[PDB]
Amino acid sequence: IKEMPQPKTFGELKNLPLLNTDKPVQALMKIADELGEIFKFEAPGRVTRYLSSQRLIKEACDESRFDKNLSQALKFVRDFAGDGLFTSWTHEKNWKKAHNILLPSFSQQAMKGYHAMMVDIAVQLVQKWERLNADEHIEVPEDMTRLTLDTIGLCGFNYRFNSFYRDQPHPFITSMVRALDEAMNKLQRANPDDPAYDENKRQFQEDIKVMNDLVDKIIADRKASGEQSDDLLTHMLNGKDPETGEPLDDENIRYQIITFLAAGHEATSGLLSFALYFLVKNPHVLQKAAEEAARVLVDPVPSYKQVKQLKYVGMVLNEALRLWPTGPAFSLYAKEDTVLGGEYPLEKGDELMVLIPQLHRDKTIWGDDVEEFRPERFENPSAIPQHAFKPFGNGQRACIGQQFALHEATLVLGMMLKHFDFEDHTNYELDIKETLVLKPEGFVVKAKSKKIPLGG
Numbered sequence: 217i218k219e220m221p222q223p224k225t226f227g228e229l230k231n232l233p234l235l236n237t238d239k240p241v242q243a244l245m246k247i248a249d250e251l252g253e254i255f256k257f258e259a260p261g262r263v264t265r266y267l268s269s270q271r272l273i274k275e276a277c278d279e280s281r282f283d284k285n286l287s288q289a290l291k292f293v294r295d296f297a298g299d300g301l302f303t304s305w306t307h308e309k310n311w312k313k314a315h316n317i318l319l320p321s322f323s324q325q326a327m328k329g330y331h332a333m334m335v336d337i338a339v340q341l342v343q344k345w346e347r348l349n350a351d352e353h354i355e356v357p358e359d360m361t362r363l364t365l366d367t368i369g370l371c372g373f374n375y376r377f378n379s380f381y382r383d384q385p386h387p388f389i390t391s392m393v394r395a396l397d398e399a400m401n402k403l404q405r406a407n408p409d410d411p412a413y414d415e416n417k418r419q420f421q422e423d424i425k426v427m428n429d430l431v432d433k434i435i436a437d438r439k440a441s442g443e444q445s446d447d448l449l450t451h452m453l454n455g456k457d458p459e460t461g462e463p464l465d466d467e468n469i470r471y472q473i474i475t476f477l478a479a480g481h482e483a484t485s486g487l488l489s490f491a492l493y494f495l496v497k498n499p500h501v502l503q504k505a506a507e508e509a510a511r512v513l514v515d516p517v518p519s520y521k522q523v524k525q526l527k528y529v530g531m532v533l534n535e536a537l538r539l540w541p542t543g544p545a546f547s548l549y550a551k552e553d554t555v556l557g558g559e560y561p562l563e564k565g566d567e568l569m570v571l572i573p574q575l576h577r578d579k580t581i582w583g584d585d586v587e588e589f590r591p592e593r594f595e596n597p598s599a600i601p602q603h604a605f606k607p608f609g610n611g612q613r614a615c616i617g618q619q620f621a622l623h624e625a626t627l628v629l630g631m632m633l634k635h636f637d638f639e640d641h642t643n644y645e646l647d648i649k650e651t652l653v654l655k656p657e658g659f660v661v662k663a664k665s666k667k668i669p670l671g672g
């Protein structure tokens with residue numbers, strides 16, 4: 217039994233002066249480097265414990281001792297994502313019901329049914345880049361967010377935001393992005409009730425109504441028409457919980473749709489953006505992955521089966537998620553009094569934070585070379601020690617989108633590698649913006665087409 221390490225406190229401000237940044241995850245990773253595998257962090261009226269070693273993270277992932285906590289960020293996102301899966305407590309009836317209903321629709325097998333719609337959007341992204349004139353460049357996270365929002369829209373409720381046809385996004389996208397931004401901004405607001413935020417409040421209400429109105433209309437339209445599609449909405453309207461025998465109600469189905477878009481799009485866009493970043497910064501790795509793309513994708517459009525054979529593309533994407541897991545922390549609470557690691561007693565309710573990019577630099581697991589980009593670390597995923605690699609969270613509260621995210625990213629990155637050579641024409645300096653997720657802000661490249669035809 218030991219005193220938990222903790223950074224310097226500054227009278228009433230406690231540890232808060234150490235996080236005066238808009239990149240708190242990066243800062244907390246520097247604190248972990250100084251303090252080690254666990255530290256307490258206190259700010260006026262708040263306390264949490266940041267874990268970073270695989271040894272302790274293994275215990276925190278014991279579901280009989282710890283369960284998902286809703287951080288303040290998740291509580292603010294709940295104001296528009298409701299009791300959708302990502303923003304629900306485990307004990308909520310709607311959490312267990314939507315989980316039992318949706319899991320089969322999100323399995324590896326289920327990806328065979330989404331593949332054609334993912335290819336539809338991925339062809340539109342390849343065609344955009346094929347049609348740029350010689351002087352132009354690509355804004356990488358911006359295009360990847362186009363792609364993932366439109367893919368989730370089409371797979372999720374057969375709705376086309378037509379993001380590649382626009383300078384200004386579809387009004388629903390503008391409202392959702394503006395809603396996310398407001399939820400995150402409320403975290404750092406000292407006097408939330410000052411009149412200077414009356415406008416933020418009104419706009420946030422207007423953004424909720426825009427989202428709810430569109431999704432409720434599409435649910436109402438599909439119920440009126442009777443039509444059966446390859447989308448998550450069809451599965452939700454038809455499905456019954458095998459436990460209770462009940463289906464989801466219309467309101468909840470709406471929250472699941474908003475949640476897939478709001479929680480799924482940007483993590484997945486960040487993944488592709490960091491992967492192409494690491495590839496243009498490591499040309500020998502880019503060449504090996506582009507070779508596999510050419511060897512495997514021998515048809516005008518990729519089949520489901522071919523995407524499964526892009527093993528090296530998979531390795532690149534896991535190594536990007538090891539260095540910069542784009543949903544970078546998840547929070548837990550002690551179900552009962554317990555002792556963590558033989559040394560740190562916790563009381564029922566005490567919160568833990570899993571600092572996922574620091575977990576992923578645990579030198580006892582990966583070797584000393586943790587900052588290096590090496591997809592070859594993932595050649596044999598069964599050898600990796602259990603709980604060492606957690607970019608999709610844990611247990612029953614893990615990412616239900618994980619197979620969908622990786623199928624999309626693998627398909628798209630292999631098409632990109634097949635169809636273009638890339639140039640880091642600005643010698644881009646990594647700048648990791650932290651919102652709900654991580655992304656490489658301002659990352660831009662040039663793509664020179666290899667002039668290889670697509671199919672229709």
Ligand code: HEM
Pocket residue numbers: 284301302303315368475476477479480481483484487541542543546547606607608609610612613614615616617618620621
């Ligand atoms: C690379 C992309 C992604 C990453 C890194 C990611 C990561 C995560 C993580 C870490 C969690 C656990 C959060 C927690 O414990 O608080 C999670 C939950 C979840 N994610 Fe993802 N995600 C990604 C893509 C997606 C996609 C594409 C979707 C849906 C289309 C999605 C839907 C969900 C949902 C609904 C949950 C809550 C599941 C539950 O608690 O039952 N995610 N994701």
Ligand SMILES: NCCc1ccc(O)c(O)c1
Pocket residue numbers: 302479480483542543544545546615617652653
């Ligand atoms: N699919 C949800 C993605 C997500 C986003 C931010 C987070 O911190 C996280 O743990 C998970």
